């Protein structure tokens, strides 16, 4: 009806944006090691 | 890697110059059980041999009917979907699908004969679920067609048993590979009604709705594909079919006092019947009441006559998120919308579970 | 490929060693699965419980438990065979027919003791054991076999028990399978097999049942218009779910036959392919 | 059994090691039937 | 042979690795499956139904509906699985006894959620989830199980002997939207076991007992059942009617026959199928608890 009764109310609200970042990095920063590699066979779908 | 099936056969009601290399056949049983089990499984009340006059019409309208009694290894052994399909055509929702189909059947076949052994099979059918002689212990699953020779109205096919799809040579054809196919009518997934992720593995059954009325039922044909597991296949498909559980329930069967046992026996003070008196020298005044119960129970809904589907699993598919392709190509001299699955090992044992609910 | 050889026996007399080539598709059941075994294994002497030869229901009972192969090829002094278990790539697997109910290509192969008639087997005399034989039968008629002999079986108490036979009847119940009907047991004497081997059969199954359909009636008064309660419900549950396990349905093989007779007729073998 | 993500090396001083590991295997596999004989 | 790979979140400390290690031969489960899987699923959370840790019956329809694998053996960085359900060719493949039961020759395994003393699982603080490996017993076993716990169960809305040997059942049973499902499923196959052919048994029973004296072997039958030998005695059992088509159809047949659909129904849809057998070659016939045994798919 419209009857304002004696209580009020806060609201609450979660948004999210996509943004672009930046990325900075110093010369020596990681150390990289890198393997080998392993063949698997296996039945395909229709071959392997 | 796979194993092959051979076996010749009249080709009245399968036809290995139409269909499509991959398409499913099924096989039927010896027409003479029918009569043995429908004498013997029909319900009280209902006449037993309506189902030996539709029948007999079946057989009069086919070639070389004076074969019938032997078994001699010459009869029309196998059969295709598509045929079952078009034969219950106007009962599937896909109304434009299944009489395209229909007529493409017609006309590719001998366009003759034809009309009347497709109604012939119809009411055959429906008299098959009229004595509870359900029609899913008499058809049988072979795989898909592979290789064929036919020199007139009888034909030796040979077709996959269980095994990948693309691991056989057909060896004629353009290439040497073939994929399944199936009629658009007929094709039924399960989990985009249920919602609910469609990745990974996802198994093949087919089912076999039962309707039971007064001088009405019907029977379609469907080839679900789900993910659901071996079991959970029957509490899934009665929440689809939750409103022929219902009607069957109550249009199943058309042809008293309790009694407080417990009560009696947590109370003393009842009339006993103590050992002595059953050795058996007066055992009738001993048992003269006791009680009296007036008990009897005939006419009730059993668990075959409320039954209305029956499945069985076909096949499996390895790869994760199936791309199953939908598209509309020639059989014969028209179109009918096709579905190709791809990479469908076959297998399993052919064992039917009856959801009656 | 595994395979399993059975030690022939010496001094076998020809008479013997003869008649065990006449059946070379015949499947025989391994207790525990080893290169190497003796026949009292084979034989049914391994095979009875508590002494007493075993009826139907251990005989049901063992072959979940026990394992099975098939016969091969048969030396005069060699016997081997071939399993049916884990992973074997058995080629060529060919089997005899050993019912009197034709096969046909797609049917699958599912196993059940002699109930129809009697037994027919091999007996060595002199070293006086005998090898019996389970009998084969697809897979669509089985469950209607087992309903079919214990009905038989409690209509005869039945006739018995009451006072009055309930004789009028529809004649002779008849097996049909390829349009042969089989008409197993004509008369109603000689009563062969009625209680000597399927006795224990109808009692587990009858009381069950009668347990069954008075349970829900004695729960809940309303369907037709000092005590545990619960032991009762608890009982029915586990013999219920045990007898529902034994008598089980299982597909072992599949005949699968190419550029061969579609339909074969007992005696005749056909080669089969591994489910 | 061999060759669980090991096949790379002997299909091709870790090599080194790895034909220690198939000589010091083999020679008791070999003994085995000299064992099994026994 | 289909093999499916778990990812090993890093960061993993080395007892925790160690301990890993260790879960060598045991059945894990999967919602959906797929090559490549990551940790969520096989920890404990995953089996949350509406927000907390799921009850045994819950846990009982967990086990049907998802998929299940065996692990096979861990490297410091992946940890491989073969599956068992889908049919796939798979040599060699043993599973550890984790029920405080032993196993012998020839014994079909099923599968149900840990009833004893608190379940022994690997802990992961550092990643915050726990899993848990499901027990695997006899079939017997858990055909007796089974029957208790519904007993209970309708009991609400527990010894157990074996080889001599009395175990005690902890039945966790806090949740109620589960426990009414299985009232629903059991009374169904009651009911539809009830065809007009009982009458015909239900007028036996005077002769039932008969044959249970002087015979010796209806004895405990009488005695282990209670609602036949407390009617025996109670009740008249009006004599007979006449059959409606007596003339070629036989009435006996479907009660005997529809009976037989149901009981062995009855034992699955109550809880878990069979899955294995277990057939050990150059082994011992019996194995101990902790020990490892060569099965065979199902």
């Given at each position: 009806?419209?009857?304002?009764?004696?209580?009020?109310?806060?609201?609450?609200?979660?948004?999210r944006f996509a943004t672009e970042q930046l990325l900075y990095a110093e010369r020596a920063s990681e150390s990289y090691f890198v393997g080998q590699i392993q063949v698997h066979h296996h039945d395909a779908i229709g071959g392997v | 890697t796979t194993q092959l099936i051979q076996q010749v056969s009249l080709t009245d009601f399968f036809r290995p110059d139409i269909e499509h290399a991959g398409s499913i056949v099924l096989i039927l049983r010896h027409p003479s059980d029918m009569i043995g089990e429908a004498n013997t499984l029909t319900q009280a009340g209902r006449d037993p041999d309506v189902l030996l006059e539709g029948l007999r019409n079946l057989f009069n309208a086919c070639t070389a009917p004076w074969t019938v009694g032997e078994g001699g290894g010459l009869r029309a052994y196998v059969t295709s979907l598509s045929f079952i399909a078009a034969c219950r055509a106007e009962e599937y929702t896909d109304k434009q699908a299944a009489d395209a189909n229909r007529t493409a059947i017609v006309s590719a076949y001998g366009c003759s004969r034809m009309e009347t052994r497709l109604i012939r099979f119809s009411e055959?059918?429906?008299?098959?679920?009229?004595?509870?002689?359900?029609?899913?212990?008499?058809?049988?699953?072979?795989?898909?067609?592979?290789?064929?020779?036919?020199?007139?109205?009888?034909?030796?096919?040979?077709?996959?048993?269980?095994?990948?799809?693309?691991?056989?040579?057909?060896?004629?054809?353009?290439?040497?590979?073939?994929?399944?196919?199936?009629?658009?009518?007929?094709?039924?997934?399960?989990?985009?009604?249920?919602?609910?992720?469609?990745?990974?593995?996802?198994?093949?059954?087919?089912?076999?709705?039962?309707?039971?009325?007064?001088?009405?039922?019907?029977?379609?044909?469907?080839?679900?594909?789900?993910?659901?597991?071996?079991?959970?296949?029957?509490?899934?498909?009665?929440?689809?079919?939750?409103?022929?559980?219902?009607?069957?329930?109550?249009?199943?069967?058309?042809?008293?006092?309790?009694?407080?046992?417990?009560?009696?026996?947590?109370?003393?003070?009842?009339?006993?019947?103590?050992?002595?008196?059953?050795?058996?020298?007066?055992?009738?005044?001993?048992?003269?009441?006791?009680?009296?119960?007036?008990?009897?129970?005939?006419?009730?809904?059993?668990?075959?006559?409320?039954?209305?589907?029956?499945?069985?699993?076909?096949?499996?598919?390895?790869?994760?998120?199936?791309?199953?392709?939908?598209?509309?190509?020639?059989?014969?001299?028209?179109?009918?919308?096709?579905?190709?699955?791809?990479?469908?090992?076959?297998?399993?044992?052919?064992?039917?579970?009856?959801?009656?609910? | 490929?595994?395979?399993?050889?059975?030690?022939?026996?010496?001094?076998?007399?020809?008479?013997?060693?003869?008649?065990?080539?006449?059946?070379?598709?015949?499947?025989?059941?391994?207790?525990?699965?080893?290169?190497?075994?003796?026949?009292?294994?084979?034989?049914?002497?391994?095979?009875?419980?508590?002494?007493?030869?075993?009826?139907?229901?251990?005989?049901?009972?063992?072959?979940?438990?026990?394992?099975?192969?098939?016969?091969?090829?048969?030396?005069?002094?060699?016997?081997?065979?071939?399993?049916?278990?884990?992973?074997?790539?058995?080629?060529?697997?060919?089997?005899?027919?050993?019912?009197?109910?034709?096969?046909?290509?797609?049917?699958?192969?599912?196993?059940?003791?002699?109930?129809?008639?009697?037994?027919?087997?091999?007996?060595?005399?002199?070293?006086?054991?005998?090898?019996?034989?389970?009998?084969?039968?697809?897979?669509?008629?089985?469950?209607?076999?087992?309903?079919?002999?214990?009905?038989?079986?409690?209509?005869?108490?039945?006739?018995?028990?009451?006072?009055?036979?309930?004789?009028?009847?529809?004649?002779?119940?008849?097996?049909?399978?390829?349009?042969?009907?089989?008409?197993?047991?004509?008369?109603?004497?000689?009563?062969?097999?009625?209680?000597?081997?399927?006795?224990?059969?109808?009692?587990?199954?009858?009381?069950?049942?009668?347990?069954?359909?008075?349970?829900?009636?004695?729960?809940?008064?309303?369907?037709?218009?000092?005590?545990?309660?619960?032991?009762?419900?608890?009982?029915?549950?586990?013999?219920?779910?045990?007898?529902?396990?034994?008598?089980?349905?299982?597909?072992?093989?599949?005949?699968?036959?190419?550029?061969?007779?579609?339909?074969?007729?007992?005696?005749?073998?056909?080669?089969?392919?591994?489910? | 059994?061999?060759?669980?993500?090991?096949?790379?090396?002997?299909?091709?001083?870790?090599?080194?090691?790895?034909?220690?590991?198939?000589?010091?295997?083999?020679?008791?596999?070999?003994?085995?039937?000299?064992?099994?004989?026994?």
């Open positions: 009806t419209g009857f304002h009764p004696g209580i009020a109310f806060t609201v609450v609200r979660q948004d | 055959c059918l429906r008299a098959m679920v009229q004595c509870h002689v359900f029609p899913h212990r008499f058809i049988s699953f072979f795989g898909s067609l592979l290789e064929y020779t036919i020199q007139d109205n009888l034909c030796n096919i040979t077709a996959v048993a269980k095994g990948p799809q693309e691991a056989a040579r057909t060896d004629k054809t353009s290439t040497r590979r073939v994929t399944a196919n199936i009629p658009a009518c007929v094709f039924w997934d399960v989990d985009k009604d249920l919602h609910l992720s469609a990745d990974g593995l996802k198994h093949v059954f087919l089912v076999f709705v039962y309707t039971q009325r007064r001088q009405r039922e019907g029977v379609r044909l469907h080839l679900a594909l789900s993910q659901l597991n071996e079991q959970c296949f029957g509490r899934g498909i009665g929440f689809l079919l939750g409103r022929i559980r219902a009607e069957n329930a109550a249009w199943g069967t058309e042809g008293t006092r309790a009694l407080p046992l417990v009560q009696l026996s947590n109370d003393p003070t009842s009339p006993r019947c103590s050992i002595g008196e059953i050795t058996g020298v007066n055992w009738n005044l001993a048992r003269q009441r006791l009680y009296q119960w007036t008990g009897d129970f005939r006419g009730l809904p059993t668990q075959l006559s409320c039954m209305y589907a029956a499945y069985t699993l076909i096949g499996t598919i390895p790869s994760e998120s199936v791309r199953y392709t939908r598209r509309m190509e020639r059989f014969g001299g028209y179109n009918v919308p096709t579905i190709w699955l791809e990479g469908v090992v076959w297998g399993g044992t052919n064992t039917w579970n009856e959801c009656y609910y | 490929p595994f395979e399993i050889e059975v030690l022939l026996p010496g001094e076998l007399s020809p008479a013997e060693t003869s008649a065990l080539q006449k059946c070379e598709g015949k499947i025989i059941t391994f207790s525990t699965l080893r290169h190497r075994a003796s026949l009292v294994d084979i034989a049914l002497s391994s095979y009875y419980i508590n002494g007493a030869p075993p009826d139907t229901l251990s005989l049901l009972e063992a072959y979940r438990m026990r394992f099975a192969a098939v016969i091969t090829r048969v030396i005069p002094g060699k016997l081997l065979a071939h399993a049916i278990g884990v992973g074997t790539p058995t080629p060529g697997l060919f089997i005899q027919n050993t019912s009197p109910v034709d096969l046909c290509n797609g049917d699958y192969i599912c196993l059940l003791p002699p109930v129809f008639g009697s037994a027919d087997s091999i007996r060595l005399d002199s070293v006086g054991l005998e090898i019996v034989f389970p009998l084969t039968i697809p897979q669509t008629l089985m469950r209607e076999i087992i309903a079919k002999v214990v009905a038989r079986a409690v209509e005869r108490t039945a006739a018995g028990a009451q006072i009055l036979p309930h004789e009028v009847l529809r004649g002779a119940d008849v097996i049909c399978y390829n349009g042969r009907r089989y008409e197993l047991e004509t008369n109603l004497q000689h009563r062969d097999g009625s209680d000597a081997a399927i006795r224990t059969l109808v009692l587990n199954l009858m009381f069950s049942i009668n347990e069954g359909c008075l349970l829900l009636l004695a729960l809940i008064p309303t369907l037709l218009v000092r005590f545990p309660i619960y032991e009762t419900i608890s009982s029915w549950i586990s013999t219920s779910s045990r007898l529902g396990d034994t008598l089980g349905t299982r597909a072992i093989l599949r005949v699968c036959v190419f550029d061969g007779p579609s339909t074969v007729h007992p005696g005749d073998r056909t080669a089969v392919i591994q489910v | 059994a061999i060759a669980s993500e090991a096949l790379s090396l002997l299909s091709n001083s870790l090599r080194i090691r790895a034909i220690q590991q198939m000589a010091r295997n083999l020679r008791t596999v070999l003994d085995s039937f000299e064992r099994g004989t026994a």
